[PDB]
Design a binder for this molecule. Structure first.
Ligand SMILES: CC(C)[C@@](O)(CC(=O)O)C(=O)O
Ligand SMILES: CC(C)[C@@](O)(CC(=O)O)C(=O)O
Ligand SMILES: [Zn+2]
Ligand SMILES: [Zn+2]
Lengths: 380, 380
């Protein structure tokens, strides 16, 4: 079976894009939620950014449970690398994450250096990281804008093999800006997989500009990706990172083994919503308030709908099932009829509709008021 | 080049799942928005449901522009078929849409009949539809739960060829409940494509239970799907239908030709939000309020961010670009420095930070108050 690690980047990619970034105590609460959700690793921040972020990464490193990878992001730069290692040093399993651009556009118009020079910068920074962290420590290299490395794709293969030769244990392939379609990205992941083989773990990091981040991450698993970077509530740059809940559930539904505590999803998402001030849309997959409604057919059974029209049960993600029938809720004519059928009581069309009005007259004269089966049986 | 028709089902699949379904005047407004958005076809409702829906389908049929396909949904049943035709009869281009289940589960546990009997029901209803609509009229057949026809997939091929032989011009393949992953569904679309060839148009209809409806619809185009059924604002059953805006933009970005007026997307979505009472989440792709922010780096240029980190411009979908720099907005130290650099005015670190405070003291003493470049230059 495939081993699939869920790597959370809410505290870095998510936090950086927030209108009001989190205080240390809010970060600690989010961290604890990630631990209890049982993600496989946590990126705690970008410690070289400022003193506060640095401190927070130190606190979170020491708080982390034993055996849990703790990543921190750094640019391909010696001083930043050193600062980053200083911040996560005390974690049981620290993981150094270094990023550098690899797309044709980036190399041509942003960095403005030759491809052989990019390879030097990659080798030097990874090699330097290895020299300060020592032999056992995981090093992750991300090629920024990998998703847009269309015209220079072959170069990309050399960049990643260079990073691996210099000491990278994980190759992270970001769809930094979502521009095309899942299978364009996935074909690129597969080709990297084909040259990387078992020399390094392939990790995927996708953004949601065209609403296909989940599908992109999910499909990447099936060409050899073993780590997926995600965020709680789809937080992150612009439209966000790959949504943790959607990806987790999708993979579970396809028969994959994940360590995630799925029953923590809804209470986690609810609290993240409070901490960000961003409401959960009522039609959001998994956690949306209204997604378990089957109200079509009120226009002319519930057990059949719940059976045939649900991917998973609401309790699976830690929600209570609302969807129940009522005697006073409009269409409760069907409910009363079915009840009377069960007890073997014969009543015509007029009597059913008459009983429905009688039930509402007792309901709307009681505070909130619900009509029990026994008393509705008694009303005949 | 691929011809790709965008078929809107907001008035049927979207409306049926709404807490408060739309009145006729609200349906008319939505209809007009779809016409102006320039979708390739519109499903106006399920006219056999009740008298009001029937009337609305008639009104919308007569209102429809010439050359615009107007679909209405019916079950595989003679009387319903007849009623449906009566409702859309007066449209310039009426399209009959008939649905019947084809999944192993449906056949075994819901319908509880043999596979040869399912084929009879499909042949009889389509053949009957053809006999009442006449030769020129488009007939669409949907095999409900096609996405879950895993174990009986080969039967599915016979069901669709049966429907085609009986008179169906369009074969619609729904992912009624999203259960697996895009490429499982897409491989199934491809195999149907392989047996259907040019005998019928392949149409796709996906739901969003696992957040992969957009990717599923998009990827289906690349194995021969020529029609995609979508809804405005991702309305529809449960988590919703394929989002029109995401699919349209994704396909355009992949170099496909669509007839959609992309610059109408944002004002349309805003009005749909008002009519449903469902807010647009600030991180929703395309139309979300906050998706064009590049505020990472305030933690320590805007033109570079907008260039390298945007799939498309906000104006492309009819939004105004907010993202601009200010002299009094915190980090306006960089703005003042850059301004002073431009005018060739030399000022030290303290003077820049001093000028920032001076600017805010004039701003927060003016109603809303903005500091012009000329007056900030004058303050030196
Ligand atoms: C660091 C990298 C994985 C990044 O998150 C970029 C960034 O936000 O620094 C990406 O989406 O490409
Ligand atoms: C009619 C059909 C295309 C359907 O919309 C089912 C329905 O809502 O009647 C689907 O998602 O399978
Ligand atoms: Zn990112
Ligand atoms: Zn549907």
């Amino acid at each position: 079976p495939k081993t699939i690690h869920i790597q959370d980047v809410t505290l870095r990619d998510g936090n950086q894009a927030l209108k009001r970034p989190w205080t240390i105590d809010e970060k600690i609460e989010v961290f604890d939620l990630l631990v209890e959700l049982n993600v496989d690793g946590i990126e705690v921040g970008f410690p070289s950014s400022n003193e506060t972020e640095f401190h927070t990464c130190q606190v979170l490193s020491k708080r982390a449970p034993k055996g849990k990878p703790i990543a921190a992001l750094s640019r391909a730069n010696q001083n930043e690398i050193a600062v980053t290692w200083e911040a996560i040093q005390k974690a049981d399993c620290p993981r150094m994450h270094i990023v550098y651009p690899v797309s044709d556009f980036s190399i041509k118009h942003v960095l403005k250096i030759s491809e052989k020079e990019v390879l030097q910068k990659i080798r030097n920074s990874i090699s330097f990281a290895r020299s300060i962290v020592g032999p056992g420590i995981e090093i992750q290299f991300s090629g920024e804008h990998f998703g847009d490395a269309i015209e220079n794709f072959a170069f990309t293969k050399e960049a990643f093999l260079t990073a691996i030769e210099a000491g990278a244990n994980i190759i992270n392939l970001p769809n930094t800006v979502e521009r095309y379609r899942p299978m364009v990205f996935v074909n690129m992941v597969k080709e990297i997989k084909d040259v990387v083989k078992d020399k390094a773990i392939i990790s995927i990091h996708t953004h949601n500009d065209l609403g296909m981040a989940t599908a992109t991450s999910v499909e990447s698993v099936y060409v050899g990706a073993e780590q997926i970077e995600v965020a709680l509530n789809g937080l992150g740059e612009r439209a966000g990172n790959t949504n943790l809940y959607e990806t987790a559930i999708a993979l579970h539904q396809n028969g994959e083994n994940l360590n995630i505590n799925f029953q923590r999803i809804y209470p986690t998402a609810k609290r993240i919503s409070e901490l960000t001030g961003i409401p959960i849309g009522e039609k959001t997959p998994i956690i949306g308030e209204d997604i378990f409604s089957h109200r079509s057919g009120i226009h002319q059974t519930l057990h059949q709908s719940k059976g045939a029209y649900r991917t998973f049960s609401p309790e699976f993600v830690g929600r209570m099932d609302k969807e129940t029938i009522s005697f006073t809720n409009q269409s409760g004519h069907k409910a009363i009829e079915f009840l009377l059928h069960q007890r073997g009581i014969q009543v015509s069309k007029e009597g059913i509709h008459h009983l429905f009005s009688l039930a509402k007259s007792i309901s709307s004269r009681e505070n909130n008021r619900e009509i029990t089966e026994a008393e509705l049986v008694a009303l005949s």
